[PDB]
């Protein structure tokens, strides 16, 4: 278990060293913070758009080097989209999910893509 | 039921806030107006090309954020192409179809893609 | 000296056979049509954006084949941008300008770019 | 004169309806937030990179439609780059600058680019 | 039956009005002329590369507007590649094939893509 | 001093091993061939377009690797554009020019760009 | 059997005449040399990334001209990735594999793509 | 003052964490290695091409985030191009130059571009 930032914002400990990836991640932190402030459709739309987009871009980056962990990673992503598409308002889950995802799954592709 | 513009041209009430989308939509209004002036092959070709192109671009935009309503939207598009490919000269149908499509189906992706 | 379409909308007599160019032209016609219905800011912004975008894209297209008539063409474009930036509500001027510009200046690059 | 969000993070009141622009803005907010926590080099590099990248992309976007307010806008951007290149630790200035810049200068191009 | 140019070179009667397409077609005329001069591997390689490339690009152009005749056209292309991949030295067939293909199959997509 | 192919068409002795470059060259040969059959405007426009496009693309290619012989090369190109812009019907000049240009100036960048 | 360079580095005998391909190949020689110096995860990651990327790019190049040997070539590539993904430390195999691959399989696409 | 790798090949101590940059650097190392084996034209062309291409790409990368140290960096690059354009066979200079350039000038932009 990694610490959950408060305020729930990206910090340099999340750096992957892929600047486009890092810049997209900042948008996912932000989407989750807005929902924590107000659980509404606008905020969910914002997060869901940024998530969908980030997951696809990152997947494309993985495929460009035929990354061996692509299948498993894509599955993790798809499971989170499902959660956003069946949103129940569990912001705590989302806060945790994103921190652990970056620091354990994204961190495993560093130097391989 | 939304009002059918006369002359059958795009107005700012159709704005989606995606400038490329709006610019493509203007070409679909125009294609339908020409057919209303003269139901010939040139006019149908023009509309059919612009429709095919717009539908594909918009679909690509939807996919870039893994838009959850993609499947349903694509199906709506494909049904209209079919109509254009089996054209019977029913310009009234087309005039209605396009107004309702933009204002109810396209308007639902705003803020999500 | 060419006729002014009424309603003020693109027709196949304006085809340049550059589909990209034709599709952008359809947006300039629409832009002038809106102004002709309501001379306001939303409508002028719409024409202005489309005009600026079309003129630059067309200019790029000319540059790609090192078109001999570029400088003269670009000077024509810049003059019209200038009129839009100092709009005076002279919708008749604009209806006229566009019709002649396409049918005389743009028709000139066909087959050369 | 606009309120400063606390915590210093992007919110939907800043939406420009250009998703690319909004997503880059989220990175400038985060950049200023880091500096507000720790005024060090890692944090300033992060803000500086994101700022330089966003300003140039936004500038390109303005240029694509030959935006009339470009020169004034670019001069605003260049002044802020300059402050970052001679950073003085004035985090309050930066919090302020960004908020007003978006809500006044960037809001101005909406519908024109 | 259309006349077979002699020398076997592209002329403006083959124009499709798509400059990229026309420029690629010129390379197919050339590939067939070389083979007519000397039926060797170099010449076949040249034609086969240019054919493969042209067919794919043109197919991509067709798909961008969801051209209704794509399937039939692609099949015609694939049948010619097969011939090149099982080359028997029948230059007369190839000379005929290309003239008839452009003037009857390619000419049918004009204004639709 | 190189032989002039008859018929005036590209052959593999002109290969530069840059497939893009070779394919554009084939269009310049064809352009000169048309003029050699009929010295008219359709034919000159065709050569002129292809020439302008090829020279700029090749120039870009040179620039991408910061080619040392660029300035000299570009000056050669610009002189020939100039002859085409003041065409005098001297088809012999053109047949000659192209053959030597490729086999001397273009052959020089091989392996350096 | 072709000679194995020592030091295990790319030389001009490996030239394919496709500069992007040659530049990528240099990265595969380097990846294998590092492993020969120290069989660790960093070195394997480096080679595996460069291999995955090169194989995909080259495959894309093959497909752009509908290269007839694509299937067989892709299979050869996939078999090598498998080896890297089940790495047993047999650097000798890898040194041999790459030399023979370039000089017999890659060399067969020259002039065809 | 950094050690010179022997054999003169890239190693992970040179990583900048910009995979594109690292992969281009590997080509400069190889270029200098060839010259170190045979001081001829094929080898110098190879280094020169790769150097020109890498320096411009890296320069573009710097420009994309409006890097503060660009002008100083570009001046360093241009000096080395100049040495290659007036090659004197001083391979020791080159081995040295590259090692220090990366480890001092290039290492400086990390995290800022």
Coordinates of C-alpha atoms in Angstrom, one line a residue, chain B residues 2-113:
Chain B
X2 CA -37.0 20.0 -33.6
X3 CA -37.7 22.6 -36.2
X4 CA -36.4 22.0 -39.7
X5 CA -34.4 25.0 -40.9
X6 CA -35.5 26.8 -44.1
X7 CA -33.4 27.3 -46.1
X8 CA -32.1 23.9 -45.0
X9 CA -28.8 25.1 -43.7
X10 CA -26.7 24.7 -40.6
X11 CA -27.2 27.4 -37.8
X12 CA -25.4 27.9 -34.5
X13 CA -28.2 26.0 -32.6
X14 CA -26.5 22.8 -34.0
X15 CA -23.1 23.6 -32.5
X16 CA -21.5 20.7 -30.8
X17 CA -18.4 22.7 -29.7
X18 CA -16.1 20.4 -31.7
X19 CA -15.1 22.7 -34.6
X20 CA -14.1 19.9 -37.0
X21 CA -17.5 18.2 -36.3
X22 CA -19.4 21.4 -36.8
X23 CA -17.6 22.1 -40.1
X24 CA -18.4 18.6 -41.3
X25 CA -22.0 19.0 -40.4
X26 CA -22.3 22.1 -42.6
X27 CA -21.4 19.8 -45.5
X28 CA -24.2 17.4 -44.7
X29 CA -26.8 20.3 -44.6
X30 CA -25.5 21.5 -47.9
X31 CA -25.7 18.0 -49.5
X32 CA -29.4 17.7 -48.4
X33 CA -30.2 21.2 -49.7
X34 CA -28.7 20.4 -53.2
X35 CA -30.8 17.2 -53.4
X36 CA -33.9 19.3 -52.5
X37 CA -33.0 21.5 -55.4
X38 CA -32.4 18.7 -57.8
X39 CA -32.5 15.0 -57.1
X40 CA -29.6 13.8 -59.3
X41 CA -26.5 11.7 -59.1
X42 CA -24.1 14.6 -58.7
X43 CA -25.9 15.8 -55.7
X44 CA -26.3 12.4 -54.2
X45 CA -22.6 11.7 -54.7
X46 CA -21.7 14.9 -52.9
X47 CA -23.9 14.1 -49.9
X48 CA -22.9 10.4 -49.8
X49 CA -19.1 11.3 -49.9
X50 CA -19.5 13.9 -47.1
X51 CA -21.7 11.6 -45.0
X52 CA -19.3 8.6 -45.3
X53 CA -16.4 10.8 -44.4
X54 CA -18.1 12.6 -41.5
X55 CA -19.4 9.4 -40.0
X56 CA -16.0 7.8 -40.1
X57 CA -14.2 10.8 -38.6
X58 CA -16.7 11.2 -35.8
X59 CA -16.5 7.5 -35.1
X60 CA -12.7 7.9 -34.9
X61 CA -13.2 10.7 -32.4
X62 CA -15.5 8.6 -30.3
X63 CA -13.0 5.7 -30.2
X64 CA -10.1 8.0 -29.1
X65 CA -11.7 8.3 -25.7
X66 CA -13.3 4.8 -25.7
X67 CA -16.7 6.5 -25.7
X68 CA -19.2 4.2 -24.1
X69 CA -22.0 5.0 -26.6
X70 CA -19.9 4.2 -29.7
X71 CA -21.7 1.0 -30.8
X72 CA -25.2 2.5 -30.7
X73 CA -24.0 5.6 -32.5
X74 CA -22.2 3.7 -35.2
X75 CA -25.3 1.7 -35.8
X76 CA -27.4 4.9 -36.3
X77 CA -24.8 6.1 -38.9
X78 CA -24.7 2.8 -40.8
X79 CA -28.5 2.8 -41.0
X80 CA -28.4 6.3 -42.7
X81 CA -25.7 5.2 -45.2
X82 CA -27.9 2.3 -46.1
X83 CA -30.7 4.8 -46.9
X84 CA -28.3 6.8 -49.0
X85 CA -27.1 3.7 -50.8
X86 CA -30.8 2.6 -51.5
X87 CA -31.9 6.2 -52.2
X88 CA -35.6 6.6 -53.1
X89 CA -35.6 10.4 -53.3
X90 CA -37.3 11.0 -49.9
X91 CA -35.6 14.3 -49.1
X92 CA -38.1 14.9 -46.2
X93 CA -36.9 11.9 -44.4
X94 CA -33.2 13.0 -44.8
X95 CA -34.0 16.6 -43.7
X96 CA -35.6 15.3 -40.5
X97 CA -33.1 12.5 -39.9
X98 CA -30.1 14.9 -39.9
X99 CA -31.7 17.5 -37.5
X100 CA -32.8 14.8 -35.0
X101 CA -29.5 13.0 -35.2
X102 CA -27.3 15.9 -34.4
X103 CA -29.6 17.4 -31.6
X104 CA -30.2 14.0 -29.9
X105 CA -27.4 11.5 -30.7
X106 CA -24.4 13.8 -31.4
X107 CA -25.4 16.1 -28.6
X108 CA -25.1 13.1 -26.1
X109 CA -21.3 12.8 -26.7
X110 CA -20.5 16.4 -25.8
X111 CA -18.0 16.5 -22.9
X112 CA -17.3 12.8 -23.2
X113 CA -15.0 12.8 -26.3

